[PDB]
């Protein structure tokens, strides 16, 4: 990820990736909050939670 200022990050953490992006759709601004909540509660699984939520919303 390269920011607007010029800083560079290399990461595998799902919450970090989602925070470092700039998603614009309002429905996509709740997945980052969900990832942050999972990070606070458990500190792991920040990617699987988003995958599961996306799968359920797709199945709907």
């Amino acid at each position: 990820i390269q920011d607007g200022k010029g800083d560079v990050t290399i990461t595998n953490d799902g919450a970090t990736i989602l925070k470092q992006m700039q998603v614009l759709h309002p429905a996509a601004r709740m997945l980052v909050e969900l990832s942050k909540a999972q990070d606070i509660e458990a500190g792991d699984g920040t990617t699987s939670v988003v995958i599961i939520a996306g799968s359920l919303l797709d199945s709907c």
């Binding site: 390269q2 992006m21 700039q22």
Partner: peptide
């Protein structure tokens, strides 16, 4: 190693 592990790139537009 640290360069070989990269898979995709996202560059944000300057403000």
């Amino acid at each position: 190693i640290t360069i070989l592990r990269i898979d995709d790139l996202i560059k944000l537009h300057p403000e």
